[PDB]
C-alpha cells in the first residue's frame, strides 16, 4: 500500500485503465480515498470534509465508487 | 598496593605446576603479552596475534617474529651476518 | 520505608545484593557528568578538569557533595 499526498496525483492514478475501484472511508477527522490498482492500493487523505466532496464528484465515470 | 610479592602474572596458576615451571614460564608470559616498538610508525603498539605473528595496532603492519618476543636473539645475529655478506658481494 | 531489611532478612552477600562494581560505575558516571557540566559552564578550566578527572578515577571523591566542596576550596 502507498499513500498519495496530492489530490492532483490521485486523480491521475484514478484514470489509469487498471484502476478497478475506488472506496471512500469517512473517519471522525478526515476522509480517505482508496483506489485499487494492479500492483498497489493508493490512499489519499483529505482532512477537510467539504474539500473531499468536490473530489468525490470529480471521479471518472465508470469507476466503481463505494462508501465505507 | 603490591598484590603479590613475586608471583606477578603467573599468579593465575595458583599453587599448581611447581615454582620452577611457574618461574620458567613467567619470562615468556610477560614477553608475549607486552607491547613492542613499531619501527614503521614509531609507536609502542605491536602485540602478538598468534605465535610468531606480531601486528601493529596503529599502522596495521604485520611482522613475522619470534614465538614469544618480537625479535629473537638469533634474529639480530642473522641480520648482521647477512648484511656483512651482502657488502662483500656488492663491493 | 526500611522494614524487613535487617541482618536477619539477608541471605545473599552484600555483593550479591548489590555489586560493588555497580556502585563504582554509578559514582564515576555521576562525578564525570558533574565535571563536564562545570567545564562547559566555565566554572572550571580544562587544567582543573583534568586534575579532578584523575582524582575521581583515583577514588578521591566519594560523592557529588565532596567533589563540589573541593572545587570551591581549590578555586579559593
Amino acid at each position: 500500500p502507498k499513500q498519495i499526498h496530492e489530490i492532483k496525483d490521485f486523480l491521475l492514478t484514478a484514470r489509469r485503465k487498471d484502476a478497478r475501484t475506488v472506496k471512500i472511508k469517512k473517519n471522525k477527522d478526515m476522509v480517505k480515498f482508496k483506489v485499487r490498482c494492479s500492483k498497489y492500493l493508493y490512499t489519499l487523505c483529505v482532512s477537510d470534509f467539504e474539500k473531499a466532496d468536490k473530489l468525490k464528484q470529480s471521479l471518472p465515470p465508470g469507476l466503481s465508487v463505494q462508501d465505507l | 598496593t603490591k598484590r603479590t610479592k613475586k608471583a606477578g602474572i603467573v599468579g593465575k596458576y595458583g599453587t599448581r605446576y611447581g615454582a620452577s615451571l611457574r618461574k620458567q614460564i613467567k619470562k615468556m608470559e610477560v614477553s608475549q603479552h607486552s607491547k613492542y616498538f613499531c619501527e614503521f610508525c614509531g609507536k609502542y603498539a605491536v602485540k602478538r596475534k598468534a605465535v610468531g605473528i606480531w601486528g601493529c595496532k596503529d599502522c596495521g603492519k604485520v611482522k613475522a617474529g619470534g614465538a614469544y618476543t618480537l625479535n629473537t636473539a638469533s634474529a639480530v645475529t642473522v641480520r648482521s651476518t647477512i648484511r656483512r655478506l651482502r657488502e662483500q658481494t656488492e663491493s | 520505608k526500611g522494614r524487613h531489611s535487617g541482618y536477619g532478612k539477608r541471605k545473599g552477600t552484600r555483593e550479591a545484593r548489590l555489586p560493588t562494581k555497580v556502585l563504582w560505575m554509578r559514582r564515576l558516571r555521576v562525578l564525570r557528568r558533574l565535571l563536564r557540566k562545570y567545564r562547559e559552564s566555565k566554572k572550571i578550566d580544562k587544567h582543573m578538569y583534568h586534575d579532578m578527572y584523575m582524582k575521581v578515577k583515583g577514588n578521591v571523591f566519594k560523592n557529588k557533595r565532596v567533589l563540589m566542596e573541593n572545587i570551591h576550596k581549590t578555586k579559593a
Binding site: - | 615451571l21 614460564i25 598468534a50 613475522a64 642473522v78 647477512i82 | -
Partner: protein, 251 residues
C-alpha cells in the same frame, strides 16, 4: 596376540592427519625462466597462522610471467618478514632476508631456510619455526653445495637448489613449558591422533611385547634390532647406545 598400536597407525583410519583448517601447502614458486636467469618481484600481503604448524606463513602475490593475471603463493615466513614488503626471487636477487636465491648465488656462511633438495622441488629442508641451514662451501667443479642441516648433518645439494635468506620465524616456541595436559590436548588436536600415549608396560601381553607380569617391567632388553618385524619392533630401535648422553656423546 593382537595388532599393537604402532601397527594400527599405518592403515590410516583414525590416525590420519587433521588438515581441515590448513591453509594449503607452503612452497616456493615453480622454477621458471624468470627465476633461473633474472629476478621476479613479489609483495607480501598477509602473515597468517597455519593450524598444526608453528611457523607462520606469508601470502605473496606475483605478476604472472606471460599471463594477464595475478599469481598467488604461500611461503614459510622468514623471521623479519612484514606485510607490504617486496620479496625478490631469482638468480640475481639481492642477498636480503626474505629473498629466494639459488644456492649458487649465496655466499658461504649465510643462513637460509626452506632449502630445496632437488632443483625445482620447491623446498624441503629447514622449514620448522626457528630452524635454518648454513651454507658451508661451494664446489664449482661438481656444481654442488655443502649445507649444515638443523640436525647437525652435512649434506650435498646441487647449486641450483633454491633457498630463502634468513631463518624460519616463530623460533623459541618449544622453550615455553605446557604445564597442562589440556595444552597438550589442544596442540595435538590440530595435528593427528597421537596423544595421550599409554605405556606398553601398562598393557596386557596380548597387545604389547612389554605387557604383563606381576610387576610393571619390560623383562627383556628394550633395544630391538633393525630387522625386527612389525609388531616386534618396539622400544629403542637399533640403539647404538643407551643411557644418559654425557661427554662427547651429547655433542
Amino acid at each position: 596376540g593382537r595388532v599393537i598400536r604402532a601397527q594400527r597407525k599405518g592403515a590410516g583410519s583414525v590416525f590420519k592427519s587433521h588438515t581441515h583448517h590448513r591453509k594449503g601447502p607452503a612452497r616456493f614458486r615453480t622454477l621458471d625462466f624468470g627465476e633461473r636467469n633474472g629476478y621476479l618481484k613479489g609483495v607480501i600481503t598477509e602473515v597468517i597462522h597455519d593450524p598444526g604448524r608453528g611457523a607462520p606463513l606469508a601470502r605473496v602475490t606475483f605478476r604472472h610471467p606471460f599471463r594477464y593475471k595475478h599469481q598467488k603463493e604461500l611461503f614459510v615466513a622468514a623471521e623479519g618478514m612484514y606485510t607490504g614488503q617486496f620479496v625478490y626471487c631469482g638468480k640475481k636477487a639481492t642477498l636480503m632476508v626474505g629473498n629466494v636465491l639459488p644456492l649458487r648465488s649465496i655466499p658461504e656462511g649465510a643462513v637460509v631456510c626452506n632449502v630445496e633438495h632437488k632443483v625445482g622441488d620447491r623446498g624441503v629442508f629447514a622449514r620448522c619455526s626457528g630452524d635454518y641451514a648454513i651454507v658451508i662451501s661451494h664446489n664449482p667443479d661438481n656444481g654442488t653445495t655443502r649445507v649444515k642441516l638443523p640436525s647437525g648433518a652435512k649434506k650435498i645439494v646441487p647449486s641450483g637448489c633454491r633457498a630463502m635468506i634468513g631463518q624460519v620465524a616463530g623460533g623459541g616456541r618449544t622453550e615455553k613449558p605446557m604445564l597442562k595436559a589440556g595444552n597438550a590436548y589442544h596442540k595435538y588436536r590440530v595435528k593427528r591422533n597421537c596423544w595421550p600415549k599409554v605405556r606398553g608396560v601398562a598393557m596386557n601381553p596380548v597387545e604389547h611385547p612389554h605387557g604383563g607380569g606381576n610387576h610393571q617391567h619390560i623383562g627383556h632388553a628394550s633395544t630391538v634390532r633393525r630387522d625386527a618385524p612389525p609388531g616386534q619392533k618396539v622400544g629403542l630401535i637399533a640403539a647404538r647406545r643407551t643411557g644418559r648422553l654425557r661427554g662427547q656423546a651429547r655433542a
